[PDB]
Write a protein that binds this ligand. Structure first.
Ligand SMILES: NS(=O)(=O)c1cc2c(cc1Cl)N[C@H]([C@H]1C[C@H]3C=C[C@@H]1C3)NS2(=O)=O
Lengths: 33, 42, 54, 184, 54
């Protein structure tokens, strides 16, 4: 398997990590108030 | 290791490290949640 | 067709297609091949299985 | 612990920023064979420069957009080619790394505000992710474009940059945790 | 310009030198023969629009 064939799941993983950090920051600011 | 090309193993290592770091951060940067009973094992 | 009609030719053996108008001027034989008008293009490149192929 | 981790944090920040910039610019990523020389080459990120043939040590820039019989019409392939050409994800990783180092340096100034260091850690982690993405798009583009090929020292410098960035994120978060712990 | 062509090989070259912007309508026999011959940079799409026989 080349990396071209299985790149989509890497993109999805990175999107998920970004989303998790965004969500945690949102929760942090929310519980700050 | 032939079934997966070298590049995939490298990026697997990179993503394992990224995920572990992100999980550590997310679980244990918000003082509000773990302030009491200082609270998470991550 | 001009060669046969205008006497310049006696017979003809070739990938020549039948049709009414062409048949109204010269006798013909029976088909010795089957065919049909068909399209022709350049092979588009093999599209790799895109993202979300799993 | 031991309160000196800011030093390792900023040293890692500057080192990883230097490694990333050096990798983006030196044009030593891919040792392979190209028909342009065909012959050997040491292609990089922006420009190709052969080392064999009639013209040695000759550097020319690469198009990223060859005539592919409307293959560039494909939305996915066009998007990938655009991202590879602009190479904005490694650039973004370097930018975030630099901003994180700046925030860490400022922490020595505005010691009252902790959120500076948390921002620094998040920036470093995001830089690591962006470096991953840049590597992935680079490799996928090269593959899309059965010979022998190999990766130059600059690519391993990029990998080192990623590792350093993630380590720095860990250290910054630990710093923030300790500071909050001792600050009630 | 006029899509027409003087000879078959001219159409072959045109489709093979058009970045897939040209489609040529020829028979089903020559088409297959070309498909089998290197570099095999062409293909046949669809089915015969009408059968005629030689
Ligand atoms: N090679 S082929 O299958 O295309 C093919 C097609 C045909 C052949 C012979 C061959 Cl080999 N001969 C027939 C003719 C023979 C006799 C029977 C019909 C006609 C008269 N016509 S055809 O049906 O057009």
């Amino acid at each position: 398997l080349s990396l071209s064939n299985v790149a989509g799941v890497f993109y999805i993983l990175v999107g998920g990590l970004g989303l998790a950090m965004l969500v945690a920051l949102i929760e942090f600011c929310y519980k700050s108030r | 290791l032939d079934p997966l090309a070298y590049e995939i193993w490298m990026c697997i290592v990179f993503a394992y490290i990224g995920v572990s770091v992100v999980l550590f951060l997310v679980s244990r940067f918000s003082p509000y949640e773990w302030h009491s009973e200082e609270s998470n094992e991550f | 067709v001009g060669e046969l009609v205008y006497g310049k030719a006696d017979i003809a053996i070739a990938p020549l297609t039948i049709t009414l108008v062409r048949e109204e001027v010269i006798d013909f034989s029976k088909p010795f091949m089957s065919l049909g008008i068909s399209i022709m293009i350049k092979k588009p490149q093999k599209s790799k299985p895109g993202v979300f192929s799993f | 612990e031991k309160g000196v981790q800011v030093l390792l944090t900023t040293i890692g920040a500057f080192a990883a920023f230097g490694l990333m910039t050096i990798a983006i610019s030196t044009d030593y990523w891919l040792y392979t064979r190209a028909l342009i020389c065909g012959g050997l080459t040491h292609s990089g990120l922006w420009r190709i420069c052969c080392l064999e043939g009639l013209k040695r040590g000759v550097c020319v820039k690469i198009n990223h957009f060859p005539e592919d019989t409307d293959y560039d019409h494909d939305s996915a392939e066009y998007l990938l080619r655009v991202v590879r050409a602009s190479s904005i994800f490694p650039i973004l990783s370097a930018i975030l790394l630099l901003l994180g180092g700046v925030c860490v340096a400022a922490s020595r100034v505005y010691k009252s505000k902790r959120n500076i260091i948390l921002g620094a850690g998040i920036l470093f982690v995001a830089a690591g992710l962006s470096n991953i993405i840049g590597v992935i798009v680079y490799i996928s583009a090269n593959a899309g474009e059965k010979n022998h090929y190999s990766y130059g020292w600059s690519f391993y410098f990029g990998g080192l940059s990623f590792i350093l960035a993630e380590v720095i994120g860990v250290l910054a978060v630990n710093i923030y945790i300790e500071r909050s712990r001792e600050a009630h | 310009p006029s899509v027409f062509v003087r000879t078959t090989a001219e159409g072959v070259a045109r489709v093979r030198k058009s970045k897939g912007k040209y489609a040529y309508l020829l028979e089903s026999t020559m088409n297959e023969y070309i498909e089998q011959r290197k570099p095999c940079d062409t293909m046949k799409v669809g089915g015969n629009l009408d059968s005629k026989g030689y």
